[PDB]
Amino acid sequence: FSVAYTLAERLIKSAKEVKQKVTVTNSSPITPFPCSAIDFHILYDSSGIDFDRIREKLRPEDNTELYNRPYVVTAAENLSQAQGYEWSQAHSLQTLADRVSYLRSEKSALPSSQSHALRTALYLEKNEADAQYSLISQRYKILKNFAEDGENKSLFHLENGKYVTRFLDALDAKDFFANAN
RNA sequence: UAUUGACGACCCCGAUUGGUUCUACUACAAACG
């Protein structure tokens, strides 16, 4: 528990970065706009137990990061009047929950066989991750939803100059999105 | 108006499928009287 809780005390700071990316419009000093967000890990013990090391193993190339994991959970409608609205949508937890649903949807609509081919490619450069995706994008039409480019040819989207993706977060959370409701 | 006057081989592989699906860490030892 101790290691898990000190992770949570770091995860809470990563979720709490919404405090300054989503901010009250025309405020001075720049007050946070009330925004709710999650960050989560899933240790496996493999990722490094220290948050700083955990995230640098998911930034495999200098412009490419395989986590979108500070996810805003506040509704878009509530956020629409803040500054930083556009960021909150890309970081909206519903984008993760939808993609998890596509992975869970069904035989599998996206085969795990092919999800893991893409998972492997994500650790390459974008030109190679996009190459693998282009070998697959029209064999599995569900992948039109997992794209983020706006073109349906890459799993990444550009965010402040970084290629960031939810796809590998969706594979992580695929089995941690269960509810009695 | 319909005549001139006999030679000569060709094909040599073509089309397509080129991976598909599943397993992606599991128990542990540190947590918990």
Short mmCIF file of C-alpha atoms (C1' of nucleotides) in Angstrom, two decimals:
data_model
loop_
_atom_site.label_atom_id
_atom_site.label_comp_id
_atom_site.label_asym_id
_atom_site.label_seq_id
_atom_site.Cartn_x
_atom_site.Cartn_y
_atom_site.Cartn_z
CA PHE A 1 0.00 0.00 0.00
CA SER A 2 2.78 2.45 0.86
CA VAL A 3 4.33 2.38 -2.62
CA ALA A 4 0.85 2.47 -4.15
CA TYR A 5 -0.15 5.50 -2.06
CA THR A 6 3.01 7.48 -2.84
CA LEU A 7 2.22 6.78 -6.50
CA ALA A 8 -1.26 8.19 -5.86
CA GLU A 9 0.27 11.29 -4.28
CA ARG A 10 2.14 11.73 -7.58
CA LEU A 11 -0.85 10.75 -9.73
CA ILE A 12 -2.95 13.31 -7.85
CA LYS A 13 -0.46 16.02 -8.89
CA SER A 14 -0.68 14.84 -12.50
CA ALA A 15 -4.46 14.98 -12.43
CA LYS A 16 -4.21 18.32 -10.63
CA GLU A 17 -2.34 19.85 -13.59
CA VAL A 18 -5.82 20.74 -14.94
CA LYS A 19 -5.61 23.52 -12.34
CA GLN A 20 -3.55 25.55 -14.83
CA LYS A 21 -4.40 24.16 -18.27
CA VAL A 22 -8.12 24.87 -17.73
CA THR A 23 -8.48 28.33 -16.26
CA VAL A 24 -11.11 31.00 -15.73
CA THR A 25 -11.34 33.26 -18.78
CA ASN A 26 -10.08 36.83 -18.19
CA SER A 27 -9.05 35.95 -14.64
CA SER A 28 -6.23 37.78 -12.89
CA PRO A 29 -4.46 36.16 -11.07
CA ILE A 30 -5.08 33.14 -13.28
CA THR A 31 -7.49 31.14 -11.16
CA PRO A 32 -8.23 27.50 -11.99
CA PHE A 33 -11.57 26.87 -13.59
CA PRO A 34 -13.20 24.07 -11.55
CA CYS A 35 -12.28 20.94 -13.48
CA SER A 36 -12.17 17.29 -12.41
CA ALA A 37 -9.58 14.88 -13.73
CA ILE A 38 -8.07 11.46 -13.16
CA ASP A 39 -4.65 9.97 -13.50
CA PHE A 40 -4.20 6.24 -13.03
CA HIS A 41 -1.39 3.75 -13.49
CA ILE A 42 -1.83 -0.09 -13.18
CA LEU A 43 1.56 -0.97 -11.71
CA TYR A 44 2.27 -4.56 -12.80
CA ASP A 45 5.55 -3.59 -10.97
CA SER A 46 7.08 -3.42 -14.45
CA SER A 47 6.67 0.35 -15.00
CA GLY A 48 9.13 1.59 -12.34
CA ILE A 49 7.10 2.36 -9.12
CA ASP A 50 8.37 5.95 -9.34
CA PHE A 51 6.07 8.23 -11.34
CA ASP A 52 8.88 10.17 -13.04
CA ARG A 53 10.41 6.92 -14.32
CA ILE A 54 6.95 5.50 -15.09
CA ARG A 55 6.13 8.20 -17.63
CA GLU A 56 9.55 8.35 -19.32
CA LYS A 57 9.17 4.70 -20.38
CA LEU A 58 6.05 5.76 -22.31
CA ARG A 59 7.72 8.69 -24.08
CA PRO A 60 9.71 6.44 -26.41
CA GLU A 61 10.88 9.20 -28.78
CA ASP A 62 11.50 12.88 -28.24
CA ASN A 63 8.27 14.05 -29.90
CA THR A 64 6.23 10.89 -29.23
CA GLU A 65 4.46 9.94 -26.01
CA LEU A 66 2.24 6.89 -25.56
CA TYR A 67 0.02 8.21 -22.79
CA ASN A 68 -2.85 10.70 -22.68
CA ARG A 69 -3.46 9.70 -19.11
CA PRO A 70 -4.43 12.90 -17.26
CA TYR A 71 -8.09 12.52 -18.25
CA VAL A 72 -10.62 15.24 -17.51
CA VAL A 73 -13.91 13.77 -16.28
CA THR A 74 -15.89 17.02 -16.04
CA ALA A 75 -18.49 17.25 -18.79
CA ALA A 76 -17.60 19.24 -21.90
CA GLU A 77 -20.65 21.47 -21.43
CA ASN A 78 -19.39 22.54 -18.01
CA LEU A 79 -15.92 23.25 -19.44
CA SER A 80 -17.06 25.19 -22.52
CA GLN A 81 -16.79 28.60 -20.83
CA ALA A 82 -13.22 28.07 -19.59
CA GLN A 83 -9.95 28.84 -21.28
CA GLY A 84 -8.20 25.66 -22.29
CA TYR A 85 -11.46 24.08 -23.44
CA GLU A 86 -9.88 22.45 -26.50
CA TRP A 87 -7.27 20.73 -24.32
CA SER A 88 -9.94 19.32 -21.97
CA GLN A 89 -11.68 17.61 -24.89
CA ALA A 90 -8.53 15.84 -26.07
CA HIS A 91 -8.01 14.87 -22.42
CA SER A 92 -11.66 13.94 -21.87
CA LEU A 93 -12.05 10.56 -20.18
CA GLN A 94 -14.96 9.76 -22.50
CA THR A 95 -12.46 9.52 -25.36
CA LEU A 96 -10.70 6.75 -23.43
CA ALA A 97 -13.94 5.04 -22.37
CA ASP A 98 -15.20 5.04 -25.97
CA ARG A 99 -11.99 3.51 -27.31
CA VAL A 100 -12.05 0.87 -24.57
CA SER A 101 -15.62 0.07 -25.65
CA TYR A 102 -14.46 -0.40 -29.25
CA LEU A 103 -11.76 -2.77 -28.01
CA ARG A 104 -14.28 -4.69 -25.91
CA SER A 105 -16.89 -4.71 -28.69
CA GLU A 106 -17.39 -7.87 -30.72
CA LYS A 107 -15.32 -12.44 -32.17
CA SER A 108 -13.38 -9.25 -31.41
CA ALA A 109 -14.08 -6.37 -33.78
CA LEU A 110 -10.44 -5.35 -33.43
CA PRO A 111 -8.50 -8.59 -32.90
CA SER A 112 -6.09 -8.59 -29.98
CA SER A 113 -3.67 -10.08 -32.51
CA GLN A 114 -3.84 -6.76 -34.39
CA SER A 115 -4.15 -4.47 -31.36
CA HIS A 116 -0.80 -5.82 -30.17
CA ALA A 117 0.77 -5.35 -33.59
CA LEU A 118 -0.21 -1.69 -33.25
CA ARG A 119 0.91 -1.62 -29.61
CA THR A 120 4.34 -2.85 -30.71
CA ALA A 121 4.52 -0.25 -33.50
CA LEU A 122 3.74 2.63 -31.13
CA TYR A 123 7.21 2.28 -29.58
CA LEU A 124 8.74 2.97 -33.01
CA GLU A 125 8.90 6.39 -34.60
CA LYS A 126 5.59 7.81 -35.80
CA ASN A 127 6.58 7.10 -39.41
CA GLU A 128 6.76 3.43 -38.45
CA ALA A 129 3.73 3.47 -36.16
CA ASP A 130 1.75 5.09 -38.98
CA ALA A 131 3.21 2.57 -41.43
CA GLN A 132 1.89 -0.35 -39.36
CA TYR A 133 -1.48 1.38 -38.97
CA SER A 134 -1.67 1.92 -42.73
CA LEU A 135 -1.16 -1.83 -43.16
CA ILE A 136 -4.25 -2.37 -41.00
CA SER A 137 -6.57 0.64 -41.19
CA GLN A 138 -8.89 -0.74 -43.89
CA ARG A 139 -8.84 -4.39 -42.82
CA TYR A 140 -10.54 -3.39 -39.53
CA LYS A 141 -12.97 -0.51 -39.98
CA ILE A 142 -13.30 -0.02 -36.20
CA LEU A 143 -9.83 1.55 -36.44
CA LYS A 144 -11.40 4.66 -37.96
CA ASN A 145 -12.48 5.38 -34.39
CA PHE A 146 -9.05 4.73 -32.83
CA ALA A 147 -7.38 7.27 -35.12
CA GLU A 148 -6.67 10.73 -33.72
CA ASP A 149 -5.09 12.59 -36.65
CA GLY A 150 -8.41 13.66 -38.17
CA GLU A 151 -7.29 11.81 -41.29
CA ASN A 152 -7.88 8.15 -40.30
CA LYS A 153 -4.26 7.23 -41.02
CA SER A 154 -2.50 7.63 -37.64
CA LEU A 155 -3.18 6.70 -34.02
CA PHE A 156 -1.40 9.87 -32.83
CA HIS A 157 -2.55 13.45 -32.61
CA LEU A 158 -0.36 16.52 -32.26
CA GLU A 159 -0.58 18.19 -28.83
CA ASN A 160 1.72 21.15 -28.09
CA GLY A 161 4.23 19.69 -30.52
CA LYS A 162 4.10 16.15 -29.11
CA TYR A 163 2.57 13.19 -30.90
CA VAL A 164 0.36 11.78 -28.15
CA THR A 165 -2.01 8.81 -28.33
CA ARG A 166 -4.83 7.26 -26.30
CA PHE A 167 -4.56 3.87 -28.02
CA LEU A 168 -2.07 2.39 -25.58
CA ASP A 169 -4.00 3.86 -22.64
CA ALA A 170 -7.10 2.13 -24.02
CA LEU A 171 -5.28 -1.20 -24.07
CA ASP A 172 -4.19 -0.64 -20.45
CA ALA A 173 -7.65 0.32 -19.21
CA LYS A 174 -9.48 -2.23 -21.40
CA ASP A 175 -10.25 -4.39 -18.35
CA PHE A 176 -10.31 -1.64 -15.70
CA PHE A 177 -13.53 -0.02 -17.01
CA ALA A 178 -16.12 -2.23 -15.32
CA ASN A 179 -19.24 -1.16 -13.47
CA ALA A 180 -22.27 -2.66 -11.77
CA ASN A 181 -24.48 -0.05 -13.45
"C1'" U B 1 -10.16 -4.12 -115.47
"C1'" A B 2 -7.49 -7.95 -111.69
"C1'" U B 3 -3.44 -9.01 -111.85
"C1'" U B 4 2.32 -10.29 -109.28
"C1'" G B 5 4.14 -15.07 -106.53
"C1'" A B 6 5.10 -18.59 -102.52
"C1'" C B 7 6.53 -18.97 -98.50
"C1'" G B 8 6.25 -19.38 -93.00
"C1'" A B 9 6.07 -21.29 -87.71
"C1'" C B 10 3.94 -19.47 -82.83
"C1'" C B 11 3.15 -20.17 -77.57
"C1'" C B 12 7.65 -20.54 -72.96
"C1'" C B 13 3.83 -19.77 -68.18
"C1'" G B 14 -0.80 -16.63 -66.99
"C1'" A B 15 -4.32 -15.22 -62.42
"C1'" U B 16 -4.64 -15.32 -56.98
"C1'" U B 17 -4.03 -15.95 -51.32
"C1'" G B 18 1.26 -14.00 -48.84
"C1'" G B 19 -0.59 -14.57 -42.97
"C1'" U B 20 -5.45 -15.38 -39.96
"C1'" U B 21 -7.29 -16.04 -34.76
"C1'" C B 22 -6.20 -16.76 -29.40
"C1'" U B 23 -2.77 -16.12 -24.97
"C1'" A B 24 0.04 -10.15 -23.86
"C1'" C B 25 2.18 -11.75 -18.11
"C1'" U B 26 0.22 -15.18 -14.00
"C1'" A B 27 1.17 -16.39 -8.89
"C1'" C B 28 4.48 -14.94 -5.30
"C1'" A B 29 8.69 -12.87 -1.49
"C1'" A B 30 7.69 -6.17 0.74
"C1'" A B 31 1.22 -5.48 1.63
"C1'" C B 32 -2.56 -7.80 5.50
"C1'" G B 33 -2.20 -9.25 12.72
#
